[PDB]
RNA sequence: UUGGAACGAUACAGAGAAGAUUAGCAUGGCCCCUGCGCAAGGAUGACA
């Protein structure tokens, strides 16, 4: 069904996304399952850099 | 006891300013001046 396969993306996306974001292995970005990149804390210069 | 992280964390410190800084004397250069030495050389005074 063309919905399962659009979740089936969306999670697979959500995971590729994921992956990219703990490139070098930084903890400090959170994607949320709404795709919005976001700090999980007040996140220093030199680690927002 | 044994692993995450280790381009991190914390601790200390944080003037992340700006610099070969600055006073005296002697040497050295130049022009005199003064004294002495050295090598010569000028002009001049003096009777029986």
Same mark, same amino acid.
């Given at each position: 069904?063309?919905?399962?396969?659009?979740?089936?993306?969306? &999670?697979?996306?959500?995971?590729?996304?994921?992956?990219?974001?703990? &490139?070098?292995?930084?903890?400090?970005?959170?994607?949320?399952?709404?795709?919005?990149?976001?700090?999980?804390?007040?996140?220093?210069?030199?680690? &927002?850099?």
């Amino acid at each position: 069904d063309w919905v399962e396969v659009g979740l089936q993306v969306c &999670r697979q996306g959500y995971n590729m996304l994921n992956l990219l974001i703990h &490139r070098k292995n930084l903890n400090y970005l959170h994607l949320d399952y709404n795709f919005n990149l976001k700090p999980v804390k007040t996140l220093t210069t030199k680690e &927002r850099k």
